[PDB]
């Protein structure tokens, strides 16, 4: 399936800034409800399960930046769409993905 409005999407992600790996992990989210940092779900829009790609979010637009992240820097995400599925009644009711 394609990432779209009201789908529950599972991604694997790696966060780098200027070539330095800062974080890695996996998450699930309900698409179309501003649940991720600005720019990331827009990069995910329309993608199929199994797609791997990069997304770039200005660090300013996320609340994380007293750090190793320079101001005006870019957050480079390497993202892989692991699974896309229909949301359950619970998930649609609350606007968030559930385990």
């Amino acid at each position: 399936m394609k990432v779209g409005q009201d789908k529950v999407v599972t991604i694997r992600y790696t966060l780098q800034v200027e070539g330095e790996v800062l974080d890695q992990g996996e998450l699930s989210y309900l698409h179309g409800h501003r649940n991720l940092i600005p720019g990331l779900e827009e990069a995910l829009e329309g993608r199929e399960e199994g797609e791997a790609f990069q997304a770039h979010v200005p660090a300013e637009k996320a609340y994380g930046a007293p750090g190793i992240i320079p101001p005006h820097a870019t957050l480079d995400f390497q993202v892989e769409v692991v699974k896309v599925r229909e949301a359950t009644p619970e998930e649609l009711l609350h606007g968030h993905a559930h385990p």
């Binding site: 992600y13 974080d23 989210y29 649940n35 991720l36 940092i37 996320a62 994380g64 930046a65 750090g67």
Partner: peptide, 14 residues
Amino acid sequence: TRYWNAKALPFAFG
């Protein structure tokens, strides 16, 4: 590595 000031990332803040 996650830290307090960026704990939600890449989920939206708040």
